[PDB]
Amino acid sequence: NLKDKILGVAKELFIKNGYNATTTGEIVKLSESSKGNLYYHFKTKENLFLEILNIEESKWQEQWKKEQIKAKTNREKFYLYNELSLTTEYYYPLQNAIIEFYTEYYKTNSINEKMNKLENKYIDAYHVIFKEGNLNGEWSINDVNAVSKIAANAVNGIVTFTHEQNINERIKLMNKFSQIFLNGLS
Amino acid sequence: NLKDKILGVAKELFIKNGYNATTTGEIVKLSESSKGNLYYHFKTKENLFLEILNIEESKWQEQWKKEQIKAKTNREKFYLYNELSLTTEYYYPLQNAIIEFYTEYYKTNSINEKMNKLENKYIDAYHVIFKEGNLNGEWSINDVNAVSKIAANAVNGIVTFTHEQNINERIKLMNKFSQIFLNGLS
Numbered sequence A, B: 001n002l003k004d005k006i007l008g009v010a011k012e013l014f015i016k017n018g019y020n021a022t023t024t025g026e027i028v029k030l031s032e033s034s035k036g037n038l039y040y041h042f043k044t045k046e047n048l049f050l051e052i053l054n055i056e057e058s059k060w061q062e063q064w065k066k067e068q069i070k071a072k073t074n075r076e077k078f079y080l081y082n083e084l085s086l087t088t089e090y091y092y093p094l095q096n097a098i099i100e101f102y103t104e105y106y107k108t109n110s111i112n113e114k115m116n117k118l119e120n121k122y123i124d125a126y127h128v129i130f131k132e133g134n135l136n137g138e139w140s141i142n143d144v145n146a147v148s149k150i151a152a153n154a155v156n157g158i159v160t161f162t163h164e165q166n167i168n169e170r171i172k173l174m175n176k177f178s179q180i181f182l183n184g185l186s
């Protein structure tokens, strides 16, 4: 495909190289497309990267549902969710491009005007595991929406900041956290 | 001193033009030094940066050594050390050039090794608080280095990926965590 081969090279590029490293034209380069082709299908290079994000945030979000069954209670759901984060082939990999990019276009408004959309689209997995855990009476989270953002960013931290050490340790550290956290809640 | 002048001019040059944008031609000329002199001391711009990053963390450890006097107990030290990390990373000038570096030499393993050695001096802070807490019995954690890494990573993730909120509410979020966390230990 045309437009489905652009995202195809852009994704990986942002990852390998970072947000700035990859260029509006460099993509058009390894994708064989016409510099113009971009404009009507993809507004700006930041719109394309803003696009790929929602795809990844989606791909993962689905893969998550299809697996979370293996977790019967939500307490397990919570552990499982965080565990799987470390291993998914989605979103999480291009997490520095996220950093680079928010600290680079943060002096504009098209940011929080298309960012928080993805933020909320993310802290949502935690929204449901907690709120559900209230219904199931697995605990009493009085400000769920908050706890969701904490948990999600504390977790995004453990995943992003340890990427380069033995995967069985990340999984160990991550479980010990999932624990301490759930624990401080009840 | 000539070694100092270089470190000095560079810290600025980076703060003002970022990492990739700064040439050693500049670090050399603006510090009335020698290109060979530079090579002898740091070999590369990468280290030159890693070296700044080290002098810096050194100060922070010390700025925090006189700051923890406001915290009687170790429960309090943990609350404050986290908040200090949140507040100061806000107006920290170099912050932008660290991100630049990190998401560039993230992949290189040569650099990635010296990094961790550095991410550790930042982790000892926790190490100490936790251990002391043990001795005074504020809590009874018995895998300090693990808890320490988990805390250092959850916290730095709240800092790094919460950016969008109004500073007043990020400081709100951080303490809620410090509490949930501190709770689940006990």
Ligand SMILES: CN(C)c1ccc(C(=C2C=CC(=[N+](C)C)C=C2)c2ccccc2)cc1
Residues within 6 Å of the ligand: A161, B060, B085, B088, B089, B092, B098, B099, B102, B118, B119, B120, B122, B123, B149, B151, B152, B153, B156, B160
């Ligand atoms: C200005 N300031 C107080 C600080 C500035 C930076 C850090 C960081 C960091 C993240 C995880 C670490 N761990 C837990 C290994 C250690 C350091 C860090 C932040 C952004 C990109 C890479 C590393 C911490 C404090």
